[PDB]
Write a protein that binds this ligand. Structure first.
Ligand SMILES: Cc1cc(C)nc(N2Cc3ccccc3C2=N)n1
Ligand SMILES: [Cl-]
Ligand SMILES: [Cl-]
Ligand SMILES: [Cl-]
Ligand SMILES: [Mg+2]
Ligand SMILES: [Mg+2]
Lengths: 142, 136
């Protein structure tokens, strides 16, 4: 998947498509919009291909990673979703939304202590009051 | 070959026994500790080809890249290592070091602050605070 592509690219250290600026930002923006058009219409398989394409070109982009993580969560591929949400958090250290979703994934993966840790981080550190309520509702059930 | 075509790791198919993999990891660390950086790099690349999802294998390769002053390449792997491990902030600490070397002090500060705020590793937090104390 996207993560193995990122690791392989790092192992090989060769020039990537991003290193040579193979696709301009404006075209990448257009493809992202097309990807979400597919998603919004229920064409989840095509949206997944487009998000995979974006994550091959520019893996270290929070917007691309979050879109793919959400698709995996919808598809109940909870470990892949959790791994990508964690990448998104590392890329965007001040948004606890991916931490909240990681917690949901961990609960579905039968890892309630990991889930609890995720939800507690939201409560302690997020300034999104609505996200905090949602995190607390999961904590109340754990 | 089937794993190449299906994206599965060599670890997934048990291509090398577990104890032999332990030995290879220990030999990689031995090269690293002895300053045999070229050999350590070969060995950590070998390990990461074998199991791209092994956090410690990735951390070894990232450390090599950081020692070699390939700071962006190190930071990229550290982000993966962090994500696969979920709750180990050591890769975030090293990313902060890389960002300082890349002349991105605001990014580094965010890394060290995240370590302070989330890590339960008191020795790691002490190191992170020492970097924060120095950031202008
Ligand atoms: C493609 C897709 C599909 C669905 C159901 N959600 C998303 N995303 C993207 C995103 C970015 C930042 C914060 C949250 C989210 C989020 N839920 N993306
Ligand atoms: Cl658990
Ligand atoms: Cl995990
Ligand atoms: Cl900066
Ligand atoms: Mg749009
Ligand atoms: Mg074992």
């Amino acid at each position: 998947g996207s993560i193995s592509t990122a690791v392989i690219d790092a192992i090989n250290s060769g020039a990537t498509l991003k290193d040579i600026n193979a696709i301009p930002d404006d075209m990448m923006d257009d493809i992202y919009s097309y990807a979400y058009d597919f998603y919004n219409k229920g064409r989840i398989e095509e949206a997944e291909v487009f998000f995979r394409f974006l994550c091959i070109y520019d893996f270290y982009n929070v917007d691309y990673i979050m879109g793919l993580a959400a698709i995996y969560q919808i598809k109940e591929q909870f470990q892949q979703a959790a791994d990508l949400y964690a990448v998104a958090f590392a890329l965007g250290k001040n948004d606890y939304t991916p931490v909240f979703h990681t917690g949901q994934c961990q609960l579905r993966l039968k890892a309630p202590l990991k889930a609890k840790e995720c939800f507690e981080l939201v409560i302690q550190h997020s300034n999104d009051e609505k996200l905090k309520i949602k995190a607390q509702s999961y904590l109340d059930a754990i």
